[PDB]
């Protein structure tokens, strides 16, 4: 996260860290949608060009974390995957369309003051909350700067970072990338003339772009950190996966009934 802030403790209890077994390292962010299901970005697990294609054994999921590197014995919970599901029509060849993925835990985690699920939007909430001008929040342990002087500091934060960005008009979004944006995407970030900044960045993928409803007081996950061109560049915006449009696929995979 660029131009963000340290998060407060338990300020985003649905935030999940995607940890790599060997070598140990941070792959991406994710969100907890239920005691046993995790939602992330597909490109975190599968991206041929960068020669990336992980499997259930290669990873670990870490829930209830604040710090990026510490092993939080008393608050975090480490789980193993049972099965991973990637959208059949996820396009990793040209635009990252449908960059979404679900992960099944081996055993349900126990909710706590540091571990709690986020909500998924319904037609009405989506309808009324996803409007240009409205602000959403982004979180992650990703890079703090697009680029930086090697060895002089540490590109990654100590604790979870948070940033609040506004949604941008499709027309504005479309006129900013030579990439082919689709209906399963959306953008956010300030405009050059807005006087503020911020953006997600490498390592932030899979993180949730959430929103709060003043009527029912609950948090809703409207998007997923997906792609971008640089980090925090003027006249450039971050792209997110449209969770609402992909909701039937989620529903189909989950099968609660």
């Amino acid at each position: 996260i660029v131009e963000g802030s340290d998060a407060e403790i338990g300020m985003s209890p649905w935030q999940v860290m995607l940890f790599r077994k060997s070598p140990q390292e941070l792959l991406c962010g994710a969100s907890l949608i239920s005691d046993r299901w995790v939602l992330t970005a597909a490109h975190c697990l599968l991206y041929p060009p960068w020669d990336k294609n992980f499997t259930e054994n290669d990873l670990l999921v870490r829930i209830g974390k604040h710090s990026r590197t510490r092993y939080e014995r008393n608050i975090e919970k480490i789980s193993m995957l049972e099965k991973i599901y990637i959208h059949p029509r996820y396009n990793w060849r040209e635009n990252l369309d449908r960059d979404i993925a679900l992960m099944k835990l081996k055993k349900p985690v126990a909710f706590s003051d540091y571990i709690h699920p986020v909500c998924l939007p319904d037609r009405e909430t989506a309808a009324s909350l996803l409007q240009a001008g409205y602000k959403g929040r982004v979180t992650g342990w990703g890079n703090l700067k697009e680029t930086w002087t090697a060895n002089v500091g540490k590109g990654q934060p100590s604790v979870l970072q948070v940033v609040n960005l506004p949604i941008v008009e499709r027309p504005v979004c479309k006129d900013s990338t030579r990439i082919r944006i689709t209906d399963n995407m959306f953008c956010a970030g300030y405009k050059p003339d807005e006087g503020k900044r911020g953006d997600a960045c490498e390592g932030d993928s899979g993180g949730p772009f959430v929103m709060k409803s003043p009527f029912n007081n609950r948090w809703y996950q409207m998007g997923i950190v997906s792609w971008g061109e640089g980090c925090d560049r003027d006249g450039k915006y971050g792209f997110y996966t449209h969770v609402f449009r992909l909701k039937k696929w989620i529903q189909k995979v989950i099968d609660q009934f």
């Binding site: 077994k21 060997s22 140990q24 390292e25 670990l60 590197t69 510490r70 092993y71 480490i78 193993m80």
Partner: peptide, 11 residues
Amino acid sequence: DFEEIPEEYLQ
């Protein structure tokens, strides 16, 4: 960096 987690998880 990372502090170590129980080896039980790391194979």
